[PDB]
């Protein structure tokens, strides 16, 4: 007698969109910037539109609808809410547009203009998202800076439920460098496996978007982590913060911190952020309508403020 999933799935009309351009084309698929105008509502919601790069395969539609099923359930301010789907030739997914791209891109673009209060706030907001997924018996299995988006520089959410599953998966092509040891060796996945991923995600941000193990082919990694080696201490990181990362990369998964705790410990550090991250001119830096300004600005509503 498992709980019944009562989530409403919404079906949207191609007539109600306007694919302004392509935001990004990658291995994940193709994401288009769009504007969704629901008919009679007199509101204009900016959206992103996900669609695998292959034309209408029966296999492609299977996997999109599994990503749709997962995101249809989740409601959290640090997890992408699926607004609905459009049933065209290929199935298209539709969420709120996250205008400042993925976080990995953002930190690389703003290496010289990001303070500690942003970095620490991000670590919190991610840990908050991941904790919400833990509360919904749901393991993400692909957490990384690339799969975190930026609604504003002050607000991030978690994306890509491609590999996500509920409650041991038999495996295919996976990102080794963000995976726990037991996930590489025995292909066992769990909430604490995502903590390892979360640890590497933090290292990603604190190194202003370095590639983990830059130039080390992925077959080797299992051999390195078995030999007790882990990622280095970033230069801006105190032992305090680096100690938290190292605790995510423990052999024993019980010994890893829980998202619950990570939320608290980072929340604490965000109150006095210069005690934990030492950055050159940390005090000076501040980030962003003075940019945004698109065509017809009247009757525009952020998705966050619409269905609810
Ligand atoms: C939540 O699932 C989506 C759904 Cl249902 C619909 C559209 C997009 C996504 N999600 C993603 C975005 C994205 C989201 C919202 N706005 C914009 C965006 O794309 C921005 C570009 C910058 C480079 C990289 O994407 N981006 C990536 C994804 C993704 O799923 N995987 C990795 C990349």
Curated annotation (Swiss-Prot):
Result of altering residue 24 to S: Found in a lung cancer sample; somatic mutation; strongly increased kinase activity; constitutively activated kinase with higher levels of basal autophosphorylation; more sensitive to gefitinib than wild-type
Cross-link (Glycyl lysine isopeptide (Lys-Gly) (interchain with G-Cter in ubiquitin)): 21, 42, 59, 62, 227, 258, 268
Protein kinase domain ranges (all copies): 17-277
Effect in UniProt of substituting residue 52 to F: Found in a lung cancer sample
Consequence of changing residue 138 to V: Found in a lung cancer sample; more sensitive to gefitinib than wild-type
Effect annotated for changing residue 95 to M: Found in a lung cancer sample; increased kinase activity
Effect of residue 10 to A: Abolishes phosphorylation
Reported effect, residue 5 to A: Abolishes phosphorylation
Record PTM Phosphotyrosine, positions in chain: 306
Substitution effect: residue 29 to S: Found in a lung cancer sample
Active site: 142 (proton acceptor)
Gene Ontology CC: basal plasma membrane; basolateral plasma membrane; cell junction; cell surface; ciliary basal body; cilium; clathrin-coated endocytic vesicle membrane; cytoplasm
Chain sites annotated for binding ATP: 23-31, 50, 95-96, 160
The family this protein is said to belong to: Belongs to the protein kinase superfamily. Tyr protein kinase family. EGF receptor subfamily.
Function: Receptor tyrosine kinase binding ligands of the EGF family and activating several signaling cascades to convert extracellular cues into appropriate cellular responses. Known ligands include EGF, TGFA/TGF-alpha, AREG, epigen/EPGN, BTC/betacellulin, epiregulin/EREG and HBEGF/heparin-binding EGF. Ligand binding triggers receptor homo- and/or heterodimerization and autophosphorylation on key cytoplasmic residues. The phosphorylated receptor recruits adapter proteins like GRB2 which in turn activates complex downstream signaling cascades.
Protein name stated in the entry: Epidermal growth factor receptor
């Amino acid at each position: 007698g498992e709980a019944p999933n009562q989530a409403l799935l919404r079906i949207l009309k191609e007539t109600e969109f306007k694919k302004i351009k392509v935001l990004g084309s990658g291995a994940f698929g193709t994401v288009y910037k769009g504007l969704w105008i629901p008919e009679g509502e007199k509101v204009k919601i900016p959206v992103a539109i996900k669609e695998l790069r292959e034309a209408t395969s029966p296999k492609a539609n299977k996997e999109i609808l599994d990503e749709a099923y997962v995101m249809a359930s989740v409601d959290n301010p640090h997890v992408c809410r699926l607004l609905g789907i459009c049933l065209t030739s290929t199935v298209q997914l539709i969420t709120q547009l996250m205008p400042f791209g993925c976080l990995l891109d953002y930190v690389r673009e703003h290496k010289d203009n990001i303070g500690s209060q942003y970095l620490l706030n991000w670590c919190v907001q991610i840990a908050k998202g991941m904790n919400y997924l833990e509360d919904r018996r749901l393991v993400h299995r692909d957490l990384a800076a690339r799969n975190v988006l930026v609604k504003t520089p002050q607000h991030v959410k978690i994306t890509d439920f491609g590999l996500a599953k509920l409650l041991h998966a038999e495996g295919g092509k996976v990102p080794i460098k963000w995976m726990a040891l037991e996930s590489i060796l025995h292909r066992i996945y769990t909430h604490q496996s995502d903590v390892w991923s979360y640890g590497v995600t933090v290292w990603e941000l604190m190194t202003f978007g370095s590639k983990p193990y830059d130039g080390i082919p992925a077959s080797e990694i299992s051999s390195i982590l078995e030999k007790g080696e882990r990622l280095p201490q970033p230069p801006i990181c105190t032992i305090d913060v680096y100690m938290i990362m190292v605790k995510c990369w423990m052999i024993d998964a019980d010994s890893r911190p829980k998202f619950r705790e990570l939320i608290i410990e980072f929340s604490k550090m965000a109150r006095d952020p210069q005690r934990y991250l030492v950055i050159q001119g940390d005090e000076r830096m501040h980030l962003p309508r003075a940019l945004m300004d698109e065509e017809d600005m009247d009757d525009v509503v952020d998705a966050d403020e619409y269905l609810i």
